[PDB]
Amino acid sequence: PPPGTPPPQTKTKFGPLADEDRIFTNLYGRHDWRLKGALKRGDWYKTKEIVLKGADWIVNEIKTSGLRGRGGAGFPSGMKWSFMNKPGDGRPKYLVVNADEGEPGTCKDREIMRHDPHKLVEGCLIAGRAMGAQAAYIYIRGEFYNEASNMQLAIAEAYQAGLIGKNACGTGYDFDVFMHRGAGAYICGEETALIESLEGKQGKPRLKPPFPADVGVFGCPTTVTNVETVAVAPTICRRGGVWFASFGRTRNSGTKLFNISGHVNRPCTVEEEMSIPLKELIERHCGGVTGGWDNLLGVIPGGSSTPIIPKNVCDDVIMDFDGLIAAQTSLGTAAIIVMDKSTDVIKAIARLISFYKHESCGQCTPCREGIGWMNKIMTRFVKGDAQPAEIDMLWEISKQIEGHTICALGDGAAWPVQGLIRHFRPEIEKRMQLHAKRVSN
């Protein structure tokens, strides 16, 4: 079989995720996160030997792994790491790890940087050789200050142990890792917008093409990759790509982090096999919805920029890329936001629309001020001060913003309203109808 052929899945249940199969063994910070602690977990083990296999060998493992990006787009990593492997230029090459964690409801990236920073630094090297990058930049939120220092502490340890820098891991490969604390801006988690911030410009997303693999930071080839993607990169090499392909459905291999926030009894972050049924997830680690499963009103599968799904759909959903697309919704960042029945769904969504309005970079016309329109519309819906015909208009405005913007933030801001109108339209109409009686009477 060609190198890019993950083994077909052959399981019919994806629920356990045995403990030894967990990737991030120090997720809850129950052990020493230092180099001695991580070494006892084998984080920097055989890193020389993996690197000297060859970049081409490393990539074919990743395609065999069938690892799709955890950042939120989900584009297969294998190809993504192969575009930058083309030897066409004599310019430097960079690997920008996107540690931004802007999307609401998502805390997973914070875990990987407090208690396993060395796993990320380790992953930079293996990915670094695959791309052949001269150095790697870690872009971290401005608000994550302590995590940045914590991450900085791990990097300094790596340098003194000889793992990175000149003769990284004794491979003869020269690699330097840098941290770049970007200031507070949700938009900076976008590939091209991230590249612009590192250049020191305002930080507005660029157009594609040219893609980052051609011009990136400082106009040089780059590969912007999320931390979870990188942090899993070495453990794929150690434990085989085929092993990872064992989990998850046929085209949706791999384990995933699920930040289950919202009205749940025991909100937490838990690594779990992807393609697990959602019900089995909520009632296995988080102790169920507050008022039992019957009080569920719908969840947001991927944090904001994911259409809500009502209770009935949740009965049989599969937490997976393909599985959720069937439900007219996208997995996104895997963050779940449960919502009890005693929740003003209109006011919940209206918050997210206000969130995007506060985060649009303003560069391109639809999202600059098209979102400003929906924010005004949704505010009046919350009060019920609107005519029922406005519902179809609000549906209409969303179609105009989708696909006409530069970055995917605009597409993100349109999905929540489409999910709202498509499932809870009767509730919106009732709010208006009440507003008619109280104001008229």
Binding site: E196, K201, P210, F218, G219
Partner: protein, 100 residues
């Protein structure tokens, strides 16, 4: 008589109003009107304007009516311009934009 293409409006980007050749006569005298101060003139042809498809037709029309004519140089077709986007983000070249 001046055969010419009407000049494009610098304050706009549309062009379909310069897709013709034209004739406009000399710009003879005007003066303030003694009573109300309007503009006055004794120049009937000064008001005039006709459209054509090419200067050859325009010259042909002018000769057939005895007018004296002279043609403004036809604007040469604009040279090709590259207008690439990626060069705005260049590694060692000066084309790199400091704004966005």
């Amino acid at each position: 008589v001046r055969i010419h293409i009407p000049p494009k409006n610098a304050m706009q980007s549309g062009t379909d109003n310069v897709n013709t050749w034209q004739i406009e006569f000399d710009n003879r005298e005007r003066w303030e009107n003694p009573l109300m101060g309007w503009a006055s003139s004794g120049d009937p042809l000064s008001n005039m304007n006709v459209q054509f498809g090419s200067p050859e037709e325009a010259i042909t029309f002018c000769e057939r009516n005895g007018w004296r004519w002279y043609v403004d140089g036809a604007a040469k077709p604009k040279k090709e311009r590259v207008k690439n986007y990626g060069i705005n983000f260049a590694w060692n070249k000066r084309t790199r934009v400091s704004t966005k």
